[PDB]
Every structure is written in C-alpha cells, then in structure tokens.
Amino acid sequence: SLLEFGKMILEETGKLAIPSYSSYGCYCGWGGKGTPKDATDRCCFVHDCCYGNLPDCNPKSDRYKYKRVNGAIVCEKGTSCENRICECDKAAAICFRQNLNTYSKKYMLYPDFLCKGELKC
C-alpha cells in the first residue's frame, strides 16, 4: 500500500513521497500519458507498468511487510498479491535512489499538456 511505498521511498532517497514523487514529470502521480521526462519519470512509468500486470490486485490499499537485511529490501511472505506489489515498489525505490543525481525540481507540478507521445509497457 501507499504507506509501505512512501516509507520505502523516504528510507531509500531521503525525500518524502509526497510532494517529491506524487506530482513529478508525466508519470509520477496518477495515471500517466506521454513520453517520460527523465530517468526518475522512467522509474514511475515502469512502476505504473508493474502495477498494470497485477489487475486483480489492489496495490494502493493492500498492505505487505518488508524488512531491511543490512540496507537491502527483502519482501516478506504474504498473499500472492502482496508479494508482487512489494517487488514493484522495491524496484521503484531502488530506481529512484539510482537516479537521485538527475532528479530535477523543474519537473515537480509539471503541466499535463506537455506530456506528449506514446510509450507502451
């Protein structure tokens, strides 16, 4: 759920999930359209695609557990949905960490009309 995802983001990147990554670019937010703006936006597009493969799951409200094995995210055993939702999110947190260097404030609160083009999952 969003509670585990936002805490995963804060732990990995130092930034709070909201407003750093809930209004960034074309994909960090709610749905998405167009061509992702930068590496950080590409993490959100791949995240959106990961959730997109889990149609009878509910990634915003179904809670999972994860532990830190020295810094590494380890998803705990749960239902089959929770396991898969945890891997989508852990991949996004690591993607956000890997691209902290190119994170740009110019892309926070980015206008919709600028999200142009087509990209498939």
Swiss-Prot record:
UniProt entry keywords in alphabetical sequence: Blood coagulation cascade inhibiting toxin, Calcium, Disulfide bond, Hemostasis impairing toxin, Hydrolase, Lipid degradation, Lipid metabolism, Metal-binding, Myotoxin, Neurotoxin, Presynaptic neurotoxin, Secreted, Toxin
GO MF assignments: calcium ion binding; calcium-dependent phospholipase A2 activity; phospholipid binding; toxin activity
Residues forming the catalytic site: 47, 89
EC number: 3.1.1.4
Summary of the tissues where the protein is detected: Expressed by the venom gland.
Enzyme type, top EC level: hydrolase
Cystines in this chain: 26-115, 28-44, 43-95, 49-121, 50-88, 57-81, 75-86
SMART domains: PA2c
Keyword Chaperone among UniProt keywords: no
Activity regulation text: Oxyphenbutazone (OPB), anisic acid and atropine inhibit the enzymatic activity by binding at the substrate-binding site. P-coumaric acid, resveratrol, spermidine, corticosterone and gramine derivative inhibit the enzymatic activity by binding at the substrate-binding site.
List of residues binding Ca(2+): 27, 29, 31, 48
Domain of life: Eukaryota
InterPro entries reported in the protein's UniProt record: PLipase_A2 (IPR001211), PLipase_A2_Asp_AS (IPR033112), PLipase_A2_dom (IPR016090), PLipase_A2_dom_sf (IPR036444), PLipase_A2_His_AS (IPR033113)
A GO cellular-component term linked to this record: extracellular region
Principal subcellular localization: secreted
UniProt-annotated location(s): Secreted
Catalytic activity from the UniProt record: a 1,2-diacyl-sn-glycero-3-phosphocholine + H2O = a 1-acyl-sn-glycero-3-phosphocholine + a fatty acid + H(+)
Swiss-Prot/TrEMBL cofactor(s): Ca(2+)
GO terms under biological process: arachidonate secretion; lipid catabolic process; negative regulation of T cell proliferation; phospholipid metabolic process
Free-text comment on the cofactor: Binds 1 Ca(2+) ion.
PANTHER family recorded: PHOSPHOLIPASE A2 FAMILY MEMBER, PHOSPHOLIPASE A2, MEMBRANE ASSOCIATED
Family: Belongs to the phospholipase A2 family. Group II subfamily. D49 sub-subfamily.
Something else known: D.russelli pulchella is synonymous with D.russelii.
Role noted for this protein: Snake venom phospholipase A2 (PLA2) that shows weak neurotoxicity and medium anticoagulant effects by binding to factor Xa (F10) and inhibiting the prothrombinase activity (IC(50) is 130 nM). It also damages vital organs such as lung, liver and kidney, displays edema-inducing activities when injected into the foot pads of mice and induces necrosis of muscle cells when injected into the thigh muscle. Has a low enzymatic activity. PLA2 catalyzes the calcium-dependent hydrolysis of the 2-acyl groups in 3-sn-phosphoglycerides.
Subunit structure and binding partners: Monomer.
Name of the molecule in the record: Basic phospholipase A2 VRV-PL-VIIIa
Taxonomic lineage: Eukaryota, Metazoa, Chordata, Craniata, Vertebrata
